[PDB]
Write a protein that binds this ligand. Sequence first.
Ligand SMILES: [Mg+2]
Ligand SMILES: [Mg+2]
Ligand SMILES: [Mg+2]
Ligand SMILES: [Mg+2]
Ligand SMILES: [Mg+2]
Ligand SMILES: [Mg+2]
Ligand SMILES: [Mg+2]
Ligand SMILES: [Mg+2]
Ligand SMILES: [Mg+2]
Ligand SMILES: [Mg+2]
Ligand SMILES: [Mg+2]
Ligand SMILES: [Mg+2]
Ligand SMILES: [Mg+2]
Ligand SMILES: [Mg+2]
Ligand SMILES: [Mg+2]
Ligand SMILES: [Mg+2]
Ligand SMILES: [Mg+2]
Ligand SMILES: [Mg+2]
Ligand SMILES: [Mg+2]
Ligand SMILES: [Mg+2]
Ligand SMILES: [Mg+2]
Ligand SMILES: [Mg+2]
Ligand SMILES: [Mg+2]
Ligand SMILES: [Mg+2]
Ligand SMILES: [Mg+2]
Ligand SMILES: [Mg+2]
Ligand SMILES: [Mg+2]
Ligand SMILES: [Mg+2]
Ligand SMILES: [Mg+2]
Ligand SMILES: [Mg+2]
Ligand SMILES: [Mg+2]
Ligand SMILES: [Mg+2]
Ligand SMILES: [Mg+2]
Ligand SMILES: [Mg+2]
Lengths: 171, 150, 55, 160
Amino acid sequence: AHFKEYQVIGRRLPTESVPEPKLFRMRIFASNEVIAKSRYWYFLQKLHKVKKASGEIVSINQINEAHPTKVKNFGVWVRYDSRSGTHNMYKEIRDVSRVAAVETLYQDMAARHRARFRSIHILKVAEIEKTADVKRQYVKQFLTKDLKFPLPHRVQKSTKTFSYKRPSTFY
Amino acid sequence: HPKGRKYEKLVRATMREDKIAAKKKLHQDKRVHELARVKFMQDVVNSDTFKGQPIFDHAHTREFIQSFIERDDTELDELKKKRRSNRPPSNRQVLLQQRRDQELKEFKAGFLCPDLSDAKNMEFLRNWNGTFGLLNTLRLIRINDKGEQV
Amino acid sequence: KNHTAHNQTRKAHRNGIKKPKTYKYPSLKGVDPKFRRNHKHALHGTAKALAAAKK
Amino acid sequence: MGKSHGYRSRTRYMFQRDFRKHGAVHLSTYLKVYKVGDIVDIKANGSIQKGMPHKFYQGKTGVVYNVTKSSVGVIINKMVGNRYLEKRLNLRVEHIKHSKCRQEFLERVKANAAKRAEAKAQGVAVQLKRQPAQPRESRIVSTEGNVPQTLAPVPYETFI
RNA sequence: GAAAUUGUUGAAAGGGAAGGGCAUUUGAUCAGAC
RNA sequence: GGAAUACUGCCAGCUGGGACUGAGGACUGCGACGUAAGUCAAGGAUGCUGGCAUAAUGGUUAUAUGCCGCCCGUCUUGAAA
RNA sequence: AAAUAUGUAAGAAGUCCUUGUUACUUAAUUGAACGUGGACAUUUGAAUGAAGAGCUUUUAGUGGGCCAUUUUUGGUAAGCAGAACUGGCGAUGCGGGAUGAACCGAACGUAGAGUUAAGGUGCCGGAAUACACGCUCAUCAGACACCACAAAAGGUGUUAGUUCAUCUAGACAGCCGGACGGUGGCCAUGGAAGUCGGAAUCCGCUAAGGAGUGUGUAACAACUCACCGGCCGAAUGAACUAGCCCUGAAAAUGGAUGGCGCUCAAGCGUGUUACCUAUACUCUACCGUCAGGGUUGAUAUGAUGCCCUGACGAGUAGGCAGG
RNA sequence: GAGAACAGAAAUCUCCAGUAGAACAAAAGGGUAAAAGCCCCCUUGAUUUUGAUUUUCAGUGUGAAUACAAACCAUGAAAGU
RNA sequence: GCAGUCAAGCGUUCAUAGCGACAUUGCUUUUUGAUUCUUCGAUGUCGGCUCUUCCUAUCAUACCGAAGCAGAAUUCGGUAAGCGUUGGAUUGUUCACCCACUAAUAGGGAACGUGAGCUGGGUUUAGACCGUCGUGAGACAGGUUAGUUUUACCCUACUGAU
Ligand SMILES: [Mg+2]
Ligand SMILES: [Mg+2]
Ligand SMILES: [Mg+2]
Ligand SMILES: [Mg+2]
Ligand SMILES: [Mg+2]
Ligand SMILES: [Mg+2]
Ligand SMILES: [Mg+2]
Ligand SMILES: [Mg+2]
Ligand SMILES: [Mg+2]
Ligand SMILES: [Mg+2]
Ligand SMILES: [Mg+2]
Ligand SMILES: [Mg+2]
Ligand SMILES: [Mg+2]
Ligand SMILES: [Mg+2]
Ligand SMILES: [Mg+2]
Ligand SMILES: [Mg+2]
Ligand SMILES: [Mg+2]
Ligand SMILES: [Mg+2]
Ligand SMILES: [Mg+2]
Ligand SMILES: [Mg+2]
Ligand SMILES: [Mg+2]
Ligand SMILES: [Mg+2]
Ligand SMILES: [Mg+2]
Ligand SMILES: [Mg+2]
Ligand SMILES: [Mg+2]
Ligand SMILES: [Mg+2]
Ligand SMILES: [Mg+2]
Ligand SMILES: [Mg+2]
Ligand SMILES: [Mg+2]
Ligand SMILES: [Mg+2]
Ligand SMILES: [Mg+2]
Ligand SMILES: [Mg+2]
Ligand SMILES: [Mg+2]
Ligand SMILES: [Mg+2]
């Protein structure tokens, strides 16, 4: 969907000989809070011996972008399950928001490797601060001084089902 | 068909024991590479420049945690010097600086799950060779921070 | 052809599977006969005593 | 050849003794006292061949109706077709034991009577039904030395 | 003096079957009533 | 540092347009507004107006058009066969 | 030693106090069973539900079954021979899968209005030739579960990644120059000098150069390559992973993503909205059935009448009722 | 296993180890160590009268089995069986 | 098929738990082209006549590629179904096998096309004989003989005609 970003802070259940258990925090990209807390318990059950009925959610908050109108370059580390095995990938996305870069990455994985949502882990999202630290040429070709390009062959949609002159694709 | 059901049982057993040996080997690799700070503060018979004073109260263990964090700064410095001008850096450089900063954030919160160094945990650590069940019986793995330990 | 237990639980649950009724004062046949005889004599004595004292 | 439906058929693991529990039986089996109305479980002993129950009644629970010299009569409900029939088994006391839940319930009855009498002598009415488990109530979770530690998913085989 | 079946006259339909259901157009025909 | 606007939620806030229906048949109930007789959108539609008064609406009947529609009875787990 | 499935209990036919009976039992004034008298209801002993509960008599049809997921036994194996649990078809229409006993949705009195399920929205055909990011060009593309089957392997087709290397001390490609000396190393040969063969595989000078990678001569020569240098000036090479495409074998009347047709799609992967329509859901009317109720006055009727309220309605074999 | 004339796989005697690896009529499964096995002593309960219960089950019959009652006996110092 | 050596992927990063593609040797001699008069054949419900289409897995004819291909004649491949593919002999029959001629005598499908288009034999009995078995009546898919199905004027399809 159109994703949001949440921090989820959870904890075990306090008991005898373990009072005040340690708190653990995650950042989940999800479209609502129910899916956010479900993904939290998925990852915490894979990393520790805690169940959803063994622990409790302490806090759920939504994180906005600090500067939503500033074009940034993001490096994303992911791992995924193909039909044969599982692999790690690194990719680069030039966009204005982390949730926007995550949406474009999910569309790119579906288009290029036929990987669905249930078989993708976002390991890390980070911003690449300097140029000459950009590895991908498809991102590098937009970081050139005084960038200009045209848009040939403009196609315009219409109504009325009939036209009375031949169209023109000039621009 | 010349397979029946006995071929299917055979291929099921072989594929299962293959997959299970793979996942078991992967879990032991994850545990060995998780329990590396323990082997670091274990090594040289608990830092054999100080193999006589068996106390390590509250500033020595902080120094040892910091040394375990910055143990790999020589490769990072060498990679900064060998990093060419018109080139993006290497994946080793990016992942090693990632390890660096993700350890330093954990240092700023609560340093490292290390030994307690306030009980017989030092004796159990010196007599704790390589098994994963020192945590199961006698760990005392209380953590500290980059300040007053708590 | 030979044997099947298909439909039989559905047939059994049509009119329900019922527990039998249980009464106060069960039947004393099948209980030990010495106890049975002495219980008869004790019951007759209690009836006589209640008819005597209890008006 | 043909099928067989003898009295102890398909009972190979059911009537054997446990590990290192062979030989004679202890005397608290023989020293226990049963009464008409007691609730008993049936667990057969393979070393005592007289007064042995059928394999259907292994693990069943019933009520005592009769006490004899070395035996006890028990009532069991058995499902036959679309109804239950009551069955009367006369077993030796080496194949039975008391049910513990009856003891817990009688202790609950005594504690209920004591609580009601003490509440009446105190001047108040207290509720004696058990309740199921309830949802939790609100709390504060302080972070004094318990700052939250950020977790992330792990790669495939890099740190392995 | 029924039906099957047939003749004549009138009306209609018909580019490899006919018949049926729901709905309305067209033509013919018809009761109630204000 | 001071705001605004998104997003989500609430109102026993107001207001315009369209469609289907009008069961019941003296009074009785619960209310609302008014100081009160009264009034009301409160236990189910009334008010005003026009045309036509016969094949006009409607029925029957013969067709046409749109969509759908395999031959009945019988035995069989299974019938258009 | 799981999971799933399984027995019992969660009280008034109960608990406590006191003392009556007996021919049973105790050494006994002990017990056992059944009682008299007294005390204990705002919760009488966990949850949720309860279309009334309990009981009796009598009689019909049936006693050929089959299909699906999962777990299984015998036969290389079958739409082969057999079992276990649940759901269905038989006995059943309706919307969808073009078509179909069994799949998906949903079960049916007669109608009106609204909303939907599963499936769809280029035209046939009601409904966006919607919006968004990519991938693919097939000289039998591909197009939606059951269901109308095909990988490893090969591709100098394209897309995205992973790990190794080289590079302004100048990488890759191209042009040009060097490519030396013991030595025509040792056997075999009519002759084979790096290049028909067996042995071999060293040394010097080097910036580098093989007791030789090929072409070549009867044998020599000559050329090339391996390896160094000059010129030109920016990134390049290998192995591997997996997306779509081509090949991965097809049989005989003319034919089938349902058809036409479609190529920045009307194909494939993914996302967000709008819209279409079932005998299903909601509201209203009418019919019938079942249940719960009201109604004494005769002058006016049918007390079998009149009336109020609520719920429900599939059906073969078969039963009963009203006409 | 260690010892003893003939004695030599193996004849009889002595000691130590020995949870059953032996035996218990027959198939297989279960059970059993101061015993259910081996050796001795005494016996006839493998008797009489009839009800109740479990398995197969229609909760019919047949077969087999279980627990009491009323007699008469066996064995044992006895409880008991 | 059995046995052994390998060695890229492997046991979703382990080589030697345990697989294991491509290879590679062994084993099957009247082992110096020797013997082998042999069709060691298969086939029991089909075979033959007549006639028409379709497939390509191509025998010939057309055009190409490779080969120590001098010429001539062949061999191995690619495209290709436009066009052809016979006359006899013979065992129950057919295939296979022979004799020729030939450019060549390719391979298949259409209810193993054409068992109520036609025919030999069967389905398909009743008469009789031999062999074997049975006390016998009888039996045998062991052998040999003789032996009854018999539309079209209907609708469509097709060929011609109003
Ligand atoms: Mg049957
Ligand atoms: Mg059924
Ligand atoms: Mg016995
Ligand atoms: Mg007539
Ligand atoms: Mg009205
Ligand atoms: Mg009319
Ligand atoms: Mg009209
Ligand atoms: Mg009309
Ligand atoms: Mg139709
Ligand atoms: Mg029929
Ligand atoms: Mg009382
Ligand atoms: Mg019957
Ligand atoms: Mg029948
Ligand atoms: Mg039937
Ligand atoms: Mg049914
Ligand atoms: Mg149905
Ligand atoms: Mg349908
Ligand atoms: Mg279909
Ligand atoms: Mg309706
Ligand atoms: Mg349309
Ligand atoms: Mg379409
Ligand atoms: Mg799509
Ligand atoms: Mg709408
Ligand atoms: Mg209904
Ligand atoms: Mg009905
Ligand atoms: Mg009927
Ligand atoms: Mg019996
Ligand atoms: Mg060809
Ligand atoms: Mg031709
Ligand atoms: Mg010829
Ligand atoms: Mg013929
Ligand atoms: Mg014919
Ligand atoms: Mg004959
Ligand atoms: Mg004749």
